Design a protein around this motif. Structure first.
Motif, PDB file in Angstrom:
ATOM      1  N   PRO A  57       0.830  -1.203   0.000  1.00 55.77           N
ATOM      2  CA  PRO A  57       0.000   0.000   0.000  1.00 55.77           C
ATOM      3  C   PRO A  57       0.867   1.256   0.000  1.00 55.77           C
ATOM      4  CG  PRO A  57       0.134  -0.869   2.188  1.00 55.77           C
ATOM      5  CD  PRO A  57       0.682  -1.936   1.267  1.00 55.77           C
ATOM      6  N   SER A  59       3.530   4.143  -1.618  1.00 56.37           N
ATOM      7  CA  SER A  59       4.686   4.311  -2.479  1.00 56.37           C
ATOM      8  C   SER A  59       5.484   3.036  -2.714  1.00 56.37           C
ATOM      9  CB  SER A  59       5.602   5.382  -1.889  1.00 56.37           C
ATOM     10  OG  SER A  59       5.862   5.133  -0.513  1.00 56.37           O
ATOM     11  N   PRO A  61       8.425   0.415  -3.139  1.00 55.22           N
ATOM     12  CA  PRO A  61       9.656   0.330  -2.358  1.00 55.22           C
ATOM     13  C   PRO A  61      10.818   0.807  -3.229  1.00 55.22           C
ATOM     14  CG  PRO A  61       9.113  -1.786  -3.201  1.00 55.22           C
ATOM     15  CD  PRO A  61       7.905  -0.924  -3.444  1.00 55.22           C
ATOM     16  N   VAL A  62      11.864   1.325  -2.598  1.00 53.31           N
ATOM     17  CA  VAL A  62      13.037   1.790  -3.318  1.00 53.31           C
ATOM     18  C   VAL A  62      14.095   0.712  -3.092  1.00 53.31           C
ATOM     19  CG1 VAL A  62      12.409   4.184  -2.929  1.00 53.31           C
ATOM     20  CG2 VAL A  62      13.892   3.054  -1.319  1.00 53.31           C
ATOM     21  N   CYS A  66      19.492   6.024  -0.584  1.00 52.53           N
ATOM     22  CA  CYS A  66      19.127   7.357  -1.051  1.00 52.53           C
ATOM     23  C   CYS A  66      20.194   8.366  -0.677  1.00 52.53           C
ATOM     24  CB  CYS A  66      17.792   7.806  -0.452  1.00 52.53           C
ATOM     25  SG  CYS A  66      16.372   7.002  -1.229  1.00 52.53           S
ATOM     26  N   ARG A  68      21.355  11.299   0.806  1.00 51.18           N
ATOM     27  CA  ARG A  68      20.739  12.197   1.774  1.00 51.18           C
ATOM     28  C   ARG A  68      21.734  12.952   2.641  1.00 51.18           C
ATOM     29  NH1 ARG A  68      15.953  14.192   2.025  1.00 51.18           N
ATOM     30  NH2 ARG A  68      15.932  13.989   4.303  1.00 51.18           N
TER      31      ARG A  68
ATOM     32  N   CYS B  29      11.065  -3.036   3.174  1.00 48.55           N
ATOM     33  CA  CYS B  29      10.571  -1.754   3.660  1.00 48.55           C
ATOM     34  C   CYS B  29       9.968  -0.898   2.592  1.00 48.55           C
ATOM     35  CB  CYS B  29      11.704  -0.978   4.290  1.00 48.55           C
ATOM     36  SG  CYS B  29      12.411  -1.894   5.666  1.00 48.55           S
ATOM     37  N   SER B  30       8.927  -0.168   2.953  1.00 52.66           N
ATOM     38  CA  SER B  30       8.307   0.735   2.006  1.00 52.66           C
ATOM     39  C   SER B  30       7.334   1.671   2.709  1.00 52.66           C
ATOM     40  CB  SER B  30       7.603  -0.048   0.895  1.00 52.66           C
ATOM     41  OG  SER B  30       6.389  -0.605   1.340  1.00 52.66           O
ATOM     42  N   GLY B  31       7.074   2.813   2.090  1.00 51.91           N
ATOM     43  CA  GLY B  31       6.148   3.754   2.685  1.00 51.91           C
ATOM     44  C   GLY B  31       6.603   5.200   2.739  1.00 51.91           C
ATOM     45  N   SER B  32       5.667   6.048   3.129  1.00 46.39           N
ATOM     46  CA  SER B  32       5.899   7.472   3.229  1.00 46.39           C
ATOM     47  C   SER B  32       6.722   7.890   4.428  1.00 46.39           C
ATOM     48  CB  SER B  32       4.569   8.196   3.282  1.00 46.39           C
ATOM     49  OG  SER B  32       4.773   9.537   3.657  1.00 46.39           O
ATOM     50  N   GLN B  64      12.872  14.189   0.965  1.00 40.03           N
ATOM     51  CA  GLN B  64      12.519  13.572   2.235  1.00 40.03           C
ATOM     52  C   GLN B  64      13.256  12.245   2.405  1.00 40.03           C
ATOM     53  OE1 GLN B  64       8.420  11.102   1.429  1.00 40.03           O
ATOM     54  NE2 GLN B  64       8.377  13.352   1.389  1.00 40.03           N
ATOM     55  N   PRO B  65      13.106  11.598   3.569  1.00 39.28           N
ATOM     56  CA  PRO B  65      13.794  10.323   3.788  1.00 39.28           C
ATOM     57  C   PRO B  65      13.182   9.147   3.054  1.00 39.28           C
ATOM     58  CG  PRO B  65      13.665  11.550   5.813  1.00 39.28           C
ATOM     59  CD  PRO B  65      12.701  12.193   4.854  1.00 39.28           C
ATOM     60  N   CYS B  66      13.998   8.139   2.808  1.00 36.14           N
ATOM     61  CA  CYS B  66      13.526   6.937   2.145  1.00 36.14           C
ATOM     62  C   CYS B  66      13.370   5.830   3.168  1.00 36.14           C
ATOM     63  CB  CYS B  66      14.522   6.486   1.091  1.00 36.14           C
ATOM     64  SG  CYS B  66      14.746   7.692  -0.225  1.00 36.14           S
ATOM     65  N   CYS B  67      12.262   5.107   3.082  1.00 29.16           N
ATOM     66  CA  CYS B  67      12.017   3.998   3.991  1.00 29.16           C
ATOM     67  C   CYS B  67      13.034   2.950   3.581  1.00 29.16           C
ATOM     68  CB  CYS B  67      10.599   3.474   3.797  1.00 29.16           C
ATOM     69  SG  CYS B  67       9.981   2.339   5.077  1.00 29.16           S
TER      70      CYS B  67
END
Lengths: 97, 97
Positions: A57, A59, A61-62, A66, A68, B29-32, B64-67
């Motif tokens: 659900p 976004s 996954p990456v 990243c 940062r 992992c994934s998400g806002s 922004q940060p990445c999950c």
């Protein structure tokens, strides 16, 4: 490649709700990190590249790290009324995957 | 939202040179992370928003940060010759912005 980026920008675009024409330095982080790819990172990309996983659900996954900011520093500027002001931790000074 | 994701996938999709009629757990992992935004991330999105920052070579910067995974655990399976195997650090056991 992931590194520190530098440019001069109008403080009125920094979203700090500030009225002002002053090109000030603003550093940030961007670039690729696909070379910091772990075994997990490789397997996730392999699963995603075959549509083996169902979209979690939200976004997607990456599958790599990243770029940062790891460190920060303030951003000073002269406002509209020609008065000095300063916002902390606004500009980046170092990056990392 | 940034949380741990858990699914059942065929080891063959794991991209590790193995065929196998075995579904194995694979968590990721994934998400806002728009919640853990820094003050630099707001001024950053604004600049990009106002188009006041020129696209650095390559990949656009994240505002922004990445999950991402913070710990791992192996994924074990029975190969085509029904022989047990394991691959360290293949699956996520914790996430973080």
């Amino acid at each position: 490649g992931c590194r520190l980026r530098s440019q001069l920008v109008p403080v009125r675009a920094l979203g700090l709700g500030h009225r002002s024409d002053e090109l000030v330095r603003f550093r940030f982080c961007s670039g690729s990190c696909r070379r910091a790819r772990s075994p997990h990172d490789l397997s996730l990309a392999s699963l995603l590249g075959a549509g083996a996983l169902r979209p979690p659900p939200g976004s997607r996954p990456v599958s790599q790290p990243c770029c940062r900011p790891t460190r920060y520093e303030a951003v000073s500027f002269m406002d509209v009324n020609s008065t000095w002001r300063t916002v902390d931790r606004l500009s980046a000074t170092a990056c990392g995957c």
